[PDB]
Amino acid sequence: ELQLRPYQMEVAQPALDGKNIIICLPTGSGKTRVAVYITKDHLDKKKQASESGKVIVLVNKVMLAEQLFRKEFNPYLKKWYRIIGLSGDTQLKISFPEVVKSYDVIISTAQILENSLLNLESGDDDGVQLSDFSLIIIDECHHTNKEAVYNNIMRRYLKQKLRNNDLKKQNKPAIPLPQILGLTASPGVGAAKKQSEAEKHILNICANLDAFTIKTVKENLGQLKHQIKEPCKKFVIANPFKEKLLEIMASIQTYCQKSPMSDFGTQHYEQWAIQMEKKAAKDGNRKDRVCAEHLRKYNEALQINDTIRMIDAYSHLETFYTDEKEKKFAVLNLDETDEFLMNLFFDNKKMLKKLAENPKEKLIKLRNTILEQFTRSESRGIIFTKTRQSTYALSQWIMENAKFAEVGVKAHHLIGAGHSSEVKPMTQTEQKEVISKFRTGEINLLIATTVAEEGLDIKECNIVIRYGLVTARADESTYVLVTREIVNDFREKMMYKAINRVQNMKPEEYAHKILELQVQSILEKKMKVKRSIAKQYNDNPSLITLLCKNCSMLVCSGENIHVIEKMHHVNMTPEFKGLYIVRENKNGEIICKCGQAWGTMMVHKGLDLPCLKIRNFVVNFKNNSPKKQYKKWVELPIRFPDLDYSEYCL
RNA sequence: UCCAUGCGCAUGACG
RNA sequence: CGUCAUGCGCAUGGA
Ligand SMILES: Nc1ncnc2c1ncn2[C@@H]1O[C@H](COP(=O)(O)OP(=O)(O)O)[C@@H](O)[C@H]1O
Ligand SMILES: [Zn+2]
């Protein structure tokens, strides 16, 4: 079987000639299948050539790899050729180079391939080359812009290509390089206020891929257009506690002589709070880092309240101050500052809570909007929002709300898996379960945070409602936008025209432009190398000291620290040990004699290790140069010794 | 299956 | 350059 649709046929035609073209098509056109056909044709040709045919397919997300190995490639070609569903998570007893030698076809993930190539350049002796393959295929090429995995990969291919040109002229023989296909929904357009900038961006993409031309369907376009149902665009749009909190912020400002130089509930105030916090850290002073941090917490509460039930802000600060109280209690087992701030809060805490019960509330507007939508439904919907906490708050509020229960439409939250912002990350398994549930109708509506926007298989949904999120199927579209669609349309128009412009270009001029872009990218990479190496020069054993940032006291030295796994830094020598405190709630966490959090107590190879984080400490060189904050160890060019387990045997 | 950690990347907003 | 929010990948250790 594997019959190929017509509009797919023409667009794929050039690649069958060895063309390293790009194929951009819309969503739902099943470019996976045309990709399969192309792979099949390339391999059959290499069979006729009596030469080995290798394909190494790449994706930026794992689940895509699983889907292609599950539903697309193996079904059609499993019996014809060897296929492997490679991924970083899937424990594979065998190393990558072997499967490079042992499988005719490969689904994979970019970073894995890059790591193998790095080992080739390194002394690990695990070797692979883009030349070793006969064909490289990529999905969502549009990510090949800025130091992305795809881009980092192709840059090597280019460099080699230019050497190949020089050798072609200088020498009759030249080394080989593979064909390159690239598939995307749309090449995309970045920060292009002009069709010229857009044209340049597109050309930069093509250069990164080194592709011959872009390809899109116009002749057979009507067939695909009718075949694919495409939704219509649309946009639809719908205190006292805040005042008290602002008053308290002003009270702290008066108590700290802190000038916001900015409005309330704005990013710039937070940015100033952080910069002031850094200055206080370098000054080793309190009510400066401390109160600045407290103010930042307050402004976070504000921005929460600006869109959210102030109950949630009360919960936010309930959590914050209760945990601070617990830290102080552990320390005890308080000064003018902490007492002032804590009491300044607790005094109004009950009143704030009472105010929180009073609705007098964007969320209340969205509730009415949503219920009105549900009356139309007769059943699938997707919410979106900026943050993770937002999704949980929405799900909690909707579940609590009786009206939505009366409607009988269930709802659940959904987020990514990155352990960031100290918020619970959903696991890939859990995400898969939830989307399966919604597809089955177990959950009528799914709250999301851009995870559902792409990758995850969500289709045939009546409505796609949004809640201040910058950005349906089954021939049913109920787009909503509560609180940039026009500007987005303008950009789409611009990129389409730029694409047509590039398609209608001289092959010579086009080749010259893309060649220049290739050279530029290579030069940028070389410059990046130059600066990156210069960063790591000092490599001092011990030229710094770790200090608590609330109480600017020496906490460690430069030499007492040791490294385990060449990842984690730790301080044995219990002179430090008697200082730090331990606390847990629900391996364990570490805190300060001042309540300042310090890190966690990891255990490696059986040694108990009070591991820590540079973020929560402030540097103090031996040269007495000003204090510093790095947010990560690698920023420091000096080198710490790997721990010797023979030492500290005890 | 879960936990914790390190590293890199892109996106949007903001300065 | 920094900030914040969001999403992704890789590599670890333990259970
Ligand atoms: N040659 C073909 N004939 C008929 N339908 C096809 C053909 N090739 C692809 N399709 C359709 O394309 C769909 C696959 O789309 P999919 O790959 O999931 O979307 P996308 O291309 O956006 O990833 C299949 O459901 C299939 O019906
Ligand atoms: Zn302290």
Numbering used by the authors: 306 to 543, 549 to 643, 669 to 695, 699 to 716, 719 to 811, 823 to 834, 843 to 945, 957 to 1020
Please quote the paper that reports this structure:
Long cytosolic double-stranded RNA (dsRNA) is recognized by MDA5. The helicase consists of two RecA-like domains, Hel1 and Hel2, and an insert domain, Hel2i, all of which form contacts with phosphate and ribose moieties of both RNA strands. The helicase and CTD, linked by a pair of α-helices referred to as the pincer domain, form a ring around the RNA.
We obtained two similarly populated structural classes, one with an intermediate helical twist (88˚) and the other with a high twist (92˚), with overall resolutions of 3.9 and 3.35 Å, respectively. Motifs Vc and VI becoming more conformationally dynamic as catalysis proceeds from the transition state to the post-hydrolysis state could cause MDA5 to relax its grip on the dsRNA and ADP. Together with the decrease in total MDA5-RNA contact area that accompanies ATP hydrolysis, this could promote dissociation of imperfect (endogenous) RNA duplexes. In the ADP-bound state, WT MDA5-RNA filament segments had the same broad distribution of low, intermediate, and high twists as in the nucleotide-free state, with intermediate twists being the most abundant.
